[PDB]
């Protein structure tokens, strides 16, 4: 951990916290919601140890990275803009890419816009968001699960923030991190309530120490949730702006990995997309699909060594 270097860089008009360790080919790690660079701590240690330059930023709006006030400053294009400037600062032609959750959606955009900068992509949890020309991303979600589905509830400015404020930052973070209930997260009406997890454990699961949860809390206490939530608030706008890529394919070699109990895997007809041919058709060089039994959404933390191995083995192929 100590050997993990922390710096602040100027990228795409913002100041970004980058955590770094190691030397060798760059592995760029993109975290998700509601996480931080810390989410990758085990992978940063492992990959650095194994002869790679591990790079894990706090994305725009998270942690120690600048958080622009405008909701519209949170399109996929803004975030990829940040990452392309970062990659230039690293002074390399290509990176290996590893991404989870919202970080993975941004990863898909990076691969869409600049496949030639990504040598291989280890994608966790969220597979490519297929652009259906007939229905916007969040509309499809609302049709399927109605208004209290979490993404839907995330859309209105300031609301989810106040609800989360009411139950407390630590409650929210524990509530989400500990969830193992499959299926669509549907909230109780008008409040956070049990949120993503109606069955919170008394003690943290063995992959998450009190110091880990405390780190997350210490940053979210400071930044709040606005920036991270803003990502979801641009999903329809992202659907509009990505029209030029409608019907396109991703050429970057991909290894997809998900926990079997991931709410993502277990909803939105994801299984059908992932396994039924659609994912492979959008992404012709999808080489492997790994489902981790008895592993929840946060698979890079819950199954850290296993993911470390899957990443190492995959990138060393090249
Ligand atoms: O609660 N989670 O485990 C969780 C966290 C983050 C996301 C991103 C896709 O919206 C979904 C679910």
TrEMBL record:
Phylogenetic placement of the source organism: Eukaryota, Viridiplantae, Streptophyta, Embryophyta, Tracheophyta
Top-level enzyme category: hydrolase
Gene encoding the protein: EH2
Domain named AB hydrolase-1: residues: 25-139
Pfam family, one: Abhydrolase_1
Protein name (Swiss-Prot/TrEMBL): soluble epoxide hydrolase
Keywords linked to the UniProt accession: Hydrolase
Biological role: Epoxide hydrolase involved in the biosynthesis of cucurbitacin and mogroside tetracyclic triterpene natural products (e.g. siamenoside I and mogrosides IV, V and VI). Cucurbitacins have cytotoxic properties and exhibit deterrent taste as a defense barrier against herbivores. Mogrosides are nonsugar highly oxygenated compounds used as high-intensity zero-calorie sweeteners; they also possess pharmacological properties such as regulating immunity, lowering blood sugar and lipid levels, protecting the liver, and acting as antioxidants and antitumor agents.
Catalytic activity, as annotated: (24S)-24,25-epoxycucurbitadienol + H2O = (24R)-24,25-dihydroxycucurbitadienol; an epoxide + H2O = an ethanediol
Keyword Hydrolase: yes
Similarity comment: Belongs to the AB hydrolase superfamily. Epoxide hydrolase family.
Pathway given in the UniProt record: Secondary metabolite biosynthesis; terpenoid biosynthesis
GO molecular function: epoxide hydrolase activity
Species name: Vigna radiata (Mung bean)
